[PDB]
Amino acid sequence: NLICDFFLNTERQGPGSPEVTLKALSFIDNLTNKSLIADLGCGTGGQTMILAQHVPGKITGIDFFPGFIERFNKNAEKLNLQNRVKGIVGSMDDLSFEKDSLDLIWSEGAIYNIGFERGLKEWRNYLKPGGYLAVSESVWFTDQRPAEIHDFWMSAYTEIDTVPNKVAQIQKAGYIPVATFILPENCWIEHYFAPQAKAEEIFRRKHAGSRIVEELITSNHHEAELYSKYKAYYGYAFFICKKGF
Numbered sequence: 001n002l003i004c005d006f007f008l009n010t011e012r013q014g015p016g017s018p019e020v021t022l023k024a025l026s027f028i029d030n031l032t033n034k035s036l037i038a039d040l041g042c043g044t045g046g047q048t049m050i051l052a053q054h055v056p057g058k059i060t061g062i063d064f065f066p067g068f069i070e071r072f073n074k075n076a077e078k079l080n081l082q083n084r085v086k087g088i089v090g091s092m093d094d095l096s097f098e099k100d101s102l103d104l105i106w107s108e109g110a111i112y113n114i115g116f117e118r119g120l121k122e123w124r125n126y127l128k129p130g131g132y133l134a135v136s137e138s139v140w141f142t143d144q145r146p147a148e149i150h151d152f153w154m155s156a157y158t159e160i161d162t163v164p165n166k167v168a169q170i171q172k173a174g175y176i177p178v179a180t181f182i183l184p185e186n187c188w189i190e191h192y193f194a195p196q197a198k199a200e201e202i203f204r205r206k207h208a209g210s211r212i213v214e215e216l217i218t219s220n221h222h223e224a225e226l227y228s229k230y231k232a233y234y235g236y237a238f239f240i241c242k243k244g245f
């Protein structure tokens with residue numbers, strides 16, 4: 001399981017970008033120095049640092065891979081945010097946060113591990129009423145897509161769905177769909193697939209012969225191809241939800 005190692009040599013493990021994280025932040029108007037924030041599936045904490053540098057309050061990143069949490073705190077350290085930004089090895093399906101105690105729950109390209117609707121449901125219980133939930137998720141841009149891309153997505157994440165369905169689910173889960181925007185293509189190509197280029201040459205050689213590596217490179221190269229060919233039918237959408245009642 002060196003899948004981790006590879007992604008340690010990258011700015012982020014999923015589509016995204018500073019402008020996008022900030023643009024989504026632009027919709028949350030309840031934050032102060034007393035706000036408790038959580039970023040679920042924070043990976044190395046790249047978006048978590050950009051976030052921490054533009055909002056007040058303490059943030060808690062949570063990720064399944066210890067390797068990412070280690071880089072998370074080390075990076076937090078260099079940036080001096082270690083006081084108000086702590087990394088923690090945990091799982092989104094088994095959180096220990098006091099009920100209705102958070103003001104903001106962040107999650108970029110990580111909610112698929114637990115499921116869109118499931119997350120909306122469960123995480124809700126850790127939010128102060130009027131609190132926010134911001135997550136980026138894979139979506140279909142249309143009601144019709146080719147078979148290649150469709151079955152590819154039915155093999156990885158079956159919950160991918162259209163923006164309209166995602167939105168109603170948010171309303172159904174007891175939130176107000178405050179803001180919803182689709183991510184620019186440069187979030188995949190520029191900030192995700194490209195950085196993955198250099199990473200590979202170095203990774204592959206450091207681990208020459210590792211069967212897992214030779215294939216990881218193949219998975220990434222296949223995803224990039226599907227994207228460069230079907231980018232018009234799918235991508236990521238960011239959702240800012242405000243807990244009801």
Ligand SMILES: Nc1ncnc2c1ncn2[C@@H]1O[C@H](CSCC[C@H](N)C(=O)O)[C@@H](O)[C@H]1O
Nearest residue numbers: 012013014041042043064091092108110113
């Ligand atoms: N059950 C789980 N609980 C918490 N994190 C998990 C998890 N399953 C997977 N993850 C993490 O979810 C992240 C998905 S990749 C996205 C990483 C980061 N949010 C970014 O945008 O760069 C990875 O860090 C993966 O390790």
